[PDB]
Amino acid sequence: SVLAASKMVGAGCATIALAGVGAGLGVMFGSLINGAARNPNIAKQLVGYALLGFALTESIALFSLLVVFLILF
Amino acid sequence: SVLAASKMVGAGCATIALAGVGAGLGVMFGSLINGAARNPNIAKQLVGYALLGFALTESIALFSLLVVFLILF
Amino acid sequence: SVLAASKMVGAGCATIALAGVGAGLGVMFGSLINGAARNPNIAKQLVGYALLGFALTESIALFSLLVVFLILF
Amino acid sequence: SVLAASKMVGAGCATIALAGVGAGLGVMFGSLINGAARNPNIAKQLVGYALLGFALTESIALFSLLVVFLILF
Amino acid sequence: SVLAASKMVGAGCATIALAGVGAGLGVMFGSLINGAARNPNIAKQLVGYALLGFALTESIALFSLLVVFLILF
Amino acid sequence: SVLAASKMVGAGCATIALAGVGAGLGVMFGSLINGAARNPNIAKQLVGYALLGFALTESIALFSLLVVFLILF
Amino acid sequence: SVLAASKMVGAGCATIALAGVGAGLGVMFGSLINGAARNPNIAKQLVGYALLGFALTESIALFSLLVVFLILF
Amino acid sequence: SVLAASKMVGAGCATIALAGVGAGLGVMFGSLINGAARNPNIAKQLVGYALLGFALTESIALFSLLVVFLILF
Amino acid sequence: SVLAASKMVGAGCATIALAGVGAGLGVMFGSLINGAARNPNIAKQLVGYALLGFALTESIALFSLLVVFLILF
Amino acid sequence: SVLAASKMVGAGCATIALAGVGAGLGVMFGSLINGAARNPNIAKQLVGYALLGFALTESIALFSLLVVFLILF
Amino acid sequence: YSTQAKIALFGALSWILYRADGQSKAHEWIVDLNLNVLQAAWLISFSSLIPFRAVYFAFRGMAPATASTLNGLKTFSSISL
Amino acid sequence: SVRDVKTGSLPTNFLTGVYRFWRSQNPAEKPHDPVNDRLLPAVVDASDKRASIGTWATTFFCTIISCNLLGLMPFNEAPTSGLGFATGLGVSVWATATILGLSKTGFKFPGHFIPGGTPWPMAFIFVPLETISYTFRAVSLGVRLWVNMLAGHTLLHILTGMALALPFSLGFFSMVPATFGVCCLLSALVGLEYLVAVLQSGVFSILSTVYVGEFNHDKFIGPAAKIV
C-alpha cells in the first residue's frame, strides 16, 4: 500500500508553503509597528488596513491547507 | 499502481510555490502600511492600488493551484 | 509497515513551516524595537499592537503543528 | 511504467520556480505603493511602469509553466 | 526495523525549524543595535524589551525541539 | 528504463533556480520604482540601467534553462 | 545495519539549522556597524549589548549541535 | 547502471545554486537603479561598478556550472 | 555497504549550513561599507569590530565543517 | 558499486552552499553601489574594502568546493 | 439561592459530573484529566491578577450614556417664584 | 414586564460598547448637501436600504467569544472545534455577503459575460478567476476559526502527554530539576490560548464586517428641488 504510504511524505512537504506565510505576515505586521511609529494619532486606519492584509494572507495559509487535507482526507 | 501513487508526492511538492506567494503579499501588504504612513490624507488610491497587486498575486496563487488539481483531478 | 514508516519522514518535513514563522516574528519583533526608537513616550500601544501580531503569528505556528500531530496521532 | 511515473515528481518540482515569481512581484508591487507615497500627483506613469514589469514577470511565470506542460502533455 | 530507522531521518529534518529561529533572533538582535543607535540615553527599556522577544523566540526554538525528542525519546 | 525516468524528476528540480530569479528581478524592479520616486525628472537613465540588469538576470534564467533542455533533449 | 546507517543522513540534515544561525548573527553584527555609525562616542554599550546577543545566538548554535552529537554519540 | 543513473538526480540538484545567484544579481541590479536615483549626473561610474559585480557574480554562476558538467561530462 | 554509502548523501546535506554562513557574512560585510559611509574619519575601529564578527562567523563555518569531517573521517 | 554511486548525489548537494555565497556577494556588492552613492569623492577606499570582503567570501566559495573535490577526487 | 438559580446550580454541576465522567471514559484519559487542572490554573490566576476596581471603571467608561453624567436641565431657567 | 434592569449594569455597558464599535465600522456616507429637515426622508431611507451590519456582527461576535470562552472553562470543550459548527458560521457569512449582491441587482443569478476586443481572451480568465477567489473567501473564513480552536488543543494534549511522563517515569518528589520548568511551559500556553480565543472572534467578525460592507453602497434620493 504505497498509495496510502507515499501521500504521508507529500503531506509534510505540502505544509512548507506555511513557512513563507509565517514570514509574510511577520514583515506585514512588522511595518504595522513602524507604520504606527510615524503617526500614532491616526493608526486605527492602519490596523483597519492590517486586518485586511492578514485576511488575504490567511487566503494563502488556508489556500495551502486546502491541499493538505485534500491529500489526507 | 505507482501512477496514482507518485502523483501524491508531487501533489504536496507543487504547493511549495504558495510559500513565496505568501511571502510576496506580505511585503506587498507591508509597504501598504508604510505607504499610508507617509500621507494618510490620500491613501484610498494606495489601497486602490493594493487590491490591484493582490489580484495579480492571486494570479500566481491560483496559477500554481491550476497545476495541483491538474495532477489530482 | 511503510504506512507507519513514511509518515515519520513527512513528520519532520512538516515542521519546516516553523522556520519562517521564527523568521517572521523576528522582524516583527525587530521593528518593535525600532518602533520604540522613534517615540518611547508612547510605546505601550505598540507593544499592545505587538502582542496582536504575535498571536496571529502563532496562528501560523500552531496552524502548522495542527498538521504534525495529525500525521503522528 | 516509470516513464509516466517519474515525470509526476518533476512535475511538482518544476513549479517551485513560481515561488520566487510570487516573491518577485510582491516587492515589485510593494515599491509601487512606496512609489506612490512620494508623489501621488503623478503616479499613472508609475502604474504605467508597473504593468510593464508585471508583464515581464509573467514572462518568467509562464516561462516556467512552459516546462510543466512540456513534461505533462 | 524501519520504525526505529526512519525516525532518524525525520529527526534531522525536524531541526531545520531552528534555521529561521536563528535568522529570527538575528534581525531581532540586529535592530536592538540600531535601536540603541537612535537614543542610547534610554536603552535599558529596549533591552528590557529585547529579553521579552528572545524569550518568545525560544518559545519557537524549544517549541520545535519538543518534537525532536518526541520523535527520539 | 530508469535512465529516461529519473531525468524527469531532476527536470523539475532543475527549474527551482527560476524561483530566486523571479525574486531577483522583483527587488530589481522594485527599486526601479523607488528609484524613480527620488527624481523622475531624469529616470530614462535608470530604466536605461534597468534593462541592463534584466538582461543580465535573464543570463541566469536562461543559464538555468540551458540545463533543463540539456537533461530533456 | 540501517540503524547506524540512517542516522548519518539525518546527521547532516540536522546541521542545516546552523545556516540561519550564521545568517542570524550576520544582520546582528551588521547593525552593530550601523549602530556605531550613528554615535561612536558611546558604542562600548552597544558592543556590550552585542556580546549579549551573540551569546544568546550561540544558545541556538549549540542548541542544534546538542542534537547532532545526540544522534552520533 | 545506477552510476550513470544517480548522477542525473544530482545533476538537477546541483543547479539550485543558480537560484540565489539569480536572487543575488537582482538586488545587485536593484540598487543600481536606486543608486542612479540619488545622482544620475554621475552614474557611469556606478554602472562601471555594476559590471564589476556582475562579473564576480558570474564567478558564482559558472562556478556552480563547473560542477554540473563535471557530473555529466 | 550502505553504511559507507549513506554517509555520502548526508555529507553534502551537512554543508548547506554554509549557505547562510555565506549570506551571514555578506550583510555583515555589507554594513561594514555602509558603516564607513557615515564617518570614514574613524573606521579602523569598525574594521577592528568587523574582524571580530568574521571570526565569530567562522565559528559557525568551521562549526558545521566539524560535522562534515566527523561523518567522512 | 554504491560507494562510487552515492557520492555523485552528495556531489551536487554539496554545491548548494554556493547558492548563498552568490546571494552573499550580491548584497555585498549591492551596498558597494549604495556606498558610492553617498560620497563618490572618496570611493577607492570602499572598493579597496570591497575587494577585501570578496576575497573573504571566496574563502567560503572555495571553502565549500574544497569538499566537492574531496568527495569526487 | 432562589428557585431559578438552583436549576442553574445542578444544571451546571450535573453538567460537570456528566462531563468529568466523560473525560475518564475517553481514550487519552490522564492526558485529559491533567488538562483540566492546568486549564483551571488560570481561572485561579485571573482572579488575583486583574484589578476589578479598574476594569469596572473602564467598562463604566465604555458607554457614553453612563460615563459622562447628565446635563439635561440646569437649575436656572427652571425656577418659579 | 421581563425584568427591572439596572440602569448602569456591567453587561449593559459592555454590550453597548461593543455594538457601538461594530456599528462604527461601517458608518453611513456623508451626504451631498447639508442635512436639513427636508433631507431627513432620505437619511432614514438610506438607513433603510443599508444592511443592518451592526447586529449581524455582534451576533457573530457574542457567539464566537461565548463559544470559545468555553474552551478555557475547566472540564469543557469549545463547540467551535467541530467542523460542523465552525464552518457553519463560515459559509453563512459568505452566504449573507452573497444574498445582498443578489439583491442589489434584482435578479437571482447574474454572472454572464460582457464582450470586449483583443484582450477579450485575457478578460475571460479573470472573472472566473475572481469567482474562484470569491468562492475561497468562504472556506478561508470558516476554517480559520476551526483550526485555531483545534490547533491549540491538539498540541496541548501532547504537552500534557509528555509533561506527565517526568513525574511518571521518575518519582513524585523529583519535581525540582525539570518538572517545575515544564509545568511553567505548559501553563504558558493556556495563557496563549486565552489570547487566541478572545481575539479569533475579533478577527472573525471584523472579516465579516469588511466582507459585507463592500455590498451596501447606495445613494440619496433627495435632490428633487434645491433652492425652492
Side-chain angles (χ1 to χ4, degrees):
Chain A
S1 68
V2 190
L3 293 169
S6 66
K7 68 171 71 177
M8 306 299 286
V9 173
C13 294
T15 68
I16 309 172
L18 267 297
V21 177
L25 53 88
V27 284
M28 190 269 170
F29 283 146
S31 295
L32 177 63
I33 313 300
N34 192 31
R38 298 294 181 184
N39 46 3
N41 195 1
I42 172 165
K44 299 296 183 182
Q45 184 180 3
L46 279 71
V47 180
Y49 293 162
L51 270 299
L52 178 65
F54 175 72
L56 298 181
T57 308
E58 295 294 326
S59 177
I60 301 298
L62 274 301
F63 191 77
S64 173
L65 261 290
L66 190 277
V67 184
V68 179
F69 293 106
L70 187 144
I71 297 302
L72 270 298
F73 291 163
Chain B
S1 68
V2 190
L3 293 169
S6 66
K7 68 171 71 177
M8 306 299 286
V9 173
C13 294
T15 68
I16 309 173
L18 267 297
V21 177
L25 53 88
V27 284
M28 190 269 170
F29 283 146
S31 295
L32 177 63
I33 313 300
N34 192 31
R38 298 294 181 184
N39 46 3
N41 195 1
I42 172 165
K44 299 296 183 182
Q45 184 180 3
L46 279 71
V47 180
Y49 293 162
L51 270 299
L52 178 65
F54 175 72
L56 298 181
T57 308
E58 295 294 326
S59 177
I60 301 298
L62 274 301
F63 191 77
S64 173
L65 261 290
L66 190 277
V67 184
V68 179
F69 293 106
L70 187 144
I71 297 302
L72 270 298
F73 291 163
Chain C
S1 68
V2 190
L3 293 169
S6 66
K7 68 171 71 177
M8 306 299 286
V9 173
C13 294
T15 68
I16 309 173
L18 267 297
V21 177
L25 53 88
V27 284
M28 190 269 170
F29 283 146
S31 295
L32 177 63
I33 313 300
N34 192 31
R38 298 294 181 184
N39 46 3
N41 195 1
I42 172 165
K44 299 296 183 182
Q45 184 180 4
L46 279 71
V47 180
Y49 293 162
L51 270 299
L52 178 65
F54 175 72
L56 298 181
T57 308
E58 295 294 326
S59 177
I60 301 298
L62 274 301
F63 191 77
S64 173
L65 261 290
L66 190 277
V67 184
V68 179
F69 293 106
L70 187 144
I71 297 302
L72 270 298
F73 291 163
Chain D
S1 68
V2 190
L3 293 169
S6 66
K7 68 171 71 177
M8 306 299 286
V9 173
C13 294
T15 68
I16 309 172
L18 267 297
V21 177
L25 53 88
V27 284
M28 190 269 170
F29 283 146
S31 295
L32 177 63
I33 313 300
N34 192 31
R38 298 294 181 184
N39 46 3
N41 195 1
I42 172 165
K44 299 296 183 182
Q45 184 180 3
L46 279 71
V47 180
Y49 293 162
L51 270 299
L52 178 65
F54 175 72
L56 298 181
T57 308
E58 295 294 326
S59 177
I60 301 298
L62 274 301
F63 191 77
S64 173
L65 261 290
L66 190 277
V67 184
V68 179
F69 293 106
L70 187 144
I71 297 302
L72 270 298
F73 291 163
Chain E
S1 68
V2 190
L3 293 169
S6 66
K7 68 171 71 177
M8 306 299 286
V9 173
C13 294
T15 68
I16 309 172
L18 267 297
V21 177
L25 53 88
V27 284
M28 190 269 170
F29 283 146
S31 295
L32 177 63
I33 313 300
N34 192 31
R38 298 294 181 184
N39 46 2
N41 195 1
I42 172 165
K44 299 296 183 182
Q45 184 180 3
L46 279 71
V47 180
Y49 293 162
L51 270 299
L52 178 65
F54 175 72
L56 298 181
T57 308
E58 295 294 326
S59 177
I60 301 298
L62 274 301
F63 191 77
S64 173
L65 261 290
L66 191 277
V67 184
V68 179
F69 293 106
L70 187 144
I71 297 302
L72 270 298
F73 291 163
Chain F
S1 67
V2 190
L3 293 169
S6 66
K7 68 171 71 177
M8 306 299 286
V9 173
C13 294
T15 68
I16 309 172
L18 267 297
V21 177
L25 53 88
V27 284
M28 190 269 170
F29 283 146
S31 295
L32 177 63
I33 313 300
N34 192 31
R38 298 294 181 184
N39 46 3
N41 195 1
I42 172 165
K44 299 296 183 182
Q45 184 180 3
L46 279 71
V47 180
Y49 293 162
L51 270 299
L52 178 65
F54 175 72
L56 298 181
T57 308
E58 295 294 326
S59 177
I60 301 298
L62 274 301
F63 191 77
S64 173
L65 261 290
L66 191 277
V67 184
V68 179
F69 293 106
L70 187 144
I71 297 302
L72 270 298
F73 291 163
Chain G
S1 68
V2 190
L3 293 169
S6 66
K7 68 171 71 177
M8 306 299 286
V9 173
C13 294
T15 68
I16 309 172
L18 267 297
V21 177
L25 53 88
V27 284
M28 190 269 170
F29 283 146
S31 295
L32 177 63
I33 313 300
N34 192 31
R38 298 294 181 184
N39 46 3
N41 195 1
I42 172 165
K44 299 296 183 182
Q45 184 180 3
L46 279 71
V47 180
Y49 293 162
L51 270 299
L52 178 65
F54 175 72
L56 298 181
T57 308
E58 295 294 326
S59 177
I60 301 298
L62 274 301
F63 191 77
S64 173
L65 261 290
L66 190 277
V67 184
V68 179
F69 293 106
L70 187 144
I71 297 302
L72 270 298
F73 291 163
Chain H
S1 68
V2 190
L3 293 169
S6 66
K7 68 171 71 177
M8 306 299 286
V9 173
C13 294
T15 68
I16 309 172
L18 267 297
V21 177
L25 53 88
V27 284
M28 190 269 170
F29 283 146
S31 295
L32 177 63
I33 313 300
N34 192 31
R38 298 294 181 184
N39 46 3
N41 195 1
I42 172 165
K44 299 296 183 182
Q45 184 180 3
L46 279 71
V47 180
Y49 293 162
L51 270 299
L52 178 65
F54 175 72
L56 298 181
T57 308
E58 295 294 326
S59 177
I60 301 298
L62 274 301
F63 191 77
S64 173
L65 261 290
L66 190 277
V67 184
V68 179
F69 293 106
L70 187 144
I71 297 302
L72 270 298
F73 291 163
Chain I
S1 68
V2 190
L3 293 169
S6 66
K7 68 171 71 177
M8 306 299 286
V9 173
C13 294
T15 68
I16 309 172
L18 267 297
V21 177
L25 53 88
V27 284
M28 190 269 170
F29 283 146
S31 295
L32 177 63
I33 313 300
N34 192 31
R38 298 294 181 184
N39 46 3
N41 195 1
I42 172 165
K44 299 296 183 182
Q45 184 180 4
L46 279 71
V47 180
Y49 293 162
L51 270 299
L52 178 65
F54 175 72
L56 298 181
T57 308
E58 295 294 326
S59 177
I60 301 298
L62 274 301
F63 191 77
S64 173
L65 261 290
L66 190 277
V67 184
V68 179
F69 293 106
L70 187 144
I71 297 302
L72 270 298
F73 291 163
Chain J
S1 68
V2 190
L3 293 169
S6 66
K7 68 171 71 177
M8 306 299 286
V9 173
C13 294
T15 68
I16 309 172
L18 267 297
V21 177
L25 53 88
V27 284
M28 190 269 170
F29 283 146
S31 295
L32 177 63
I33 313 300
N34 192 31
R38 298 294 181 184
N39 46 3
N41 195 1
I42 172 165
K44 299 296 183 182
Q45 184 180 4
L46 279 71
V47 180
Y49 293 162
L51 270 299
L52 178 65
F54 175 72
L56 298 181
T57 308
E58 295 294 326
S59 177
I60 301 298
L62 274 301
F63 191 77
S64 173
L65 261 290
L66 190 277
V67 184
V68 179
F69 293 106
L70 187 144
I71 297 302
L72 270 298
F73 291 163
Chain K
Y1 293 104
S2 67
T3 301
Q4 185 58 253
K6 291 185 264 76
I7 302 170
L9 193 275
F10 62 92
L13 192 146
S14 176
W15 182 258
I16 288 170
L17 192 275
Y18 180 77
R19 185 71 186 166
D21 184 74
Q23 301 293 106
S24 177
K25 289 179 177 179
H27 182 76
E28 293 182 354
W29 62 277
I30 197 61
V31 177
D32 288 336
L33 288 181
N34 296 118
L35 183 61
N36 293 318
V37 66
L38 189 144
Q39 188 175 357
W42 291 93
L43 274 300
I44 297 173
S45 174
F46 289 161
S47 295
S48 65
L49 184 64
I50 59 171
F52 294 99
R53 63 177 177 87
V55 173
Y56 180 73
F57 292 97
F59 289 160
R60 184 73 181 162
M62 186 65 74
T66 59
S68 303
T69 184
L70 273 301
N71 56 1
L73 191 145
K74 300 294 186 181
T75 184
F76 290 163
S77 71
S78 176
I79 63 173
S80 293
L81 56 84
Chain L
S1 68
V2 177
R3 288 182 294 115
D4 289 332
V5 65
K6 187 179 181 290
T7 303
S9 66
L10 196 277
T12 301
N13 288 314
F14 181 71
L15 195 276
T16 185
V18 172
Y19 180 73
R20 290 176 70 252
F21 180 72
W22 293 103
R23 177 64 177 86
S24 177
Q25 295 295 323
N26 290 118
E29 185 178 359
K30 183 174 171 66
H32 295 84
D33 55 356
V35 176
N36 290 318
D37 293 329
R38 66 177 297 273
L39 271 304
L40 194 143
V43 176
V44 70
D45 186 75
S47 176
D48 193 0
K49 295 184 293 295
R50 186 176 179 272
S52 178
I53 190 57
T55 308
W56 294 349
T58 308
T59 300
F60 293 153
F61 180 74
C62 291
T63 298
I64 301 297
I65 292 175
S66 296
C67 290
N68 293 327
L69 184 63
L70 296 179
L72 189 139
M73 294 299 289
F75 291 157
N76 195 358
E77 292 298 325
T80 62
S81 298
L83 195 277
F85 183 71
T87 65
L89 296 178
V91 179
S92 68
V93 179
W94 182 65
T96 302
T98 305
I99 300 303
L100 292 181
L102 300 178
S103 176
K104 302 293 181 180
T105 188
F107 294 99
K108 298 290 104 177
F109 62 99
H112 62 88
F113 292 100
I114 61 168
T118 306
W120 181 67
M122 181 267 168
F124 181 76
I125 195 67
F126 182 72
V127 175
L129 191 145
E130 184 64 28
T131 297
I132 198 66
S133 175
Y134 179 69
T135 299
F136 290 165
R137 187 178 288 171
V139 178
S140 73
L141 189 56
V143 192
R144 163 217 320 294
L145 193 149
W146 180 66
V147 179
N148 289 321
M149 297 294 108
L150 210 146
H153 187 261
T154 302
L155 169 71
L156 183 62
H157 288 171
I158 307 303
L159 294 179
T160 303
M162 291 180 67
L164 182 66
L166 296 173
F168 182 71
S169 179
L170 282 75
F172 293 163
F173 183 77
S174 179
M175 61 84 71
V176 286
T179 299
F180 181 75
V182 171
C183 186
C184 188
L185 191 149
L186 265 70
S187 182
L189 195 136
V190 178
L192 180 62
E193 188 177 359
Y194 180 72
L195 204 274
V196 175
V198 176
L199 194 272
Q200 186 60 46
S201 69
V203 171
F204 177 79
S205 185
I206 198 61
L207 263 65
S208 173
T209 304
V210 171
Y211 290 166
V212 175
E214 64 181 4
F215 289 95
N216 55 5
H217 63 86
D218 288 325
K219 63 181 183 293
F220 293 96
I221 309 96
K226 183 262 296 177
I227 194 64
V228 68

